[PDB]
Amino acid sequence: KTHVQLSLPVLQVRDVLVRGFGDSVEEVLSEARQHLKDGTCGLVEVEKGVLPQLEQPYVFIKRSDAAPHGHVMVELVAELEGIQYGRSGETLGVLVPHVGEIPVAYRKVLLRK
Numbered sequence: 001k002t003h004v005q006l007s008l009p010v011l012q013v014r015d016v017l018v019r020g021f022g023d024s025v026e027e028v029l030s031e032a033r034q035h036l037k038d039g040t041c042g043l044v045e046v047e048k049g050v051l052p053q054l055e056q057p058y059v060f061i062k063r064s065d066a067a068p069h070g071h072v073m074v075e076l077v078a079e080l081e082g083i084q085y086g087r088s089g090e091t092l093g094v095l096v097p098h099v100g101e102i103p104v105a106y107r108k109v110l111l112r113k
């Protein structure tokens, strides 16, 4: 399928044990997609002070359209040293590996893949 319905655990930035997916734009998009498939991907909501606490390159989920079955349609956009790879809508948050941190909420998304 071109899209998959996912329910992403929303993590507090200070709970995150692995603060990024790797070392290059291509690796972090690859790893983020693999973790989304395997159900081991969390979401951190972006506010003041969050991004400097996470590791670049960043993988964002961004709104791709204006929301089937309660799932907002999203796509992946990576960022490194102020350059974004991808063009999309409003940021829903930054993806990180999930290694068993307790979430504060779940975010339902329809991931374009």
Ligand SMILES: O=C1NCCN[C@H]1c1ccc(O)cc1
Residues within 6 Å of the ligand: 004, 006, 033, 034, 036, 037, 038, 039, 111, 113
């Ligand atoms: O996340 C998923 N859940 C169910 C099966 N498919 C996936 C998936 C496949 C490929 C991707 O690139 C990203 C996600």
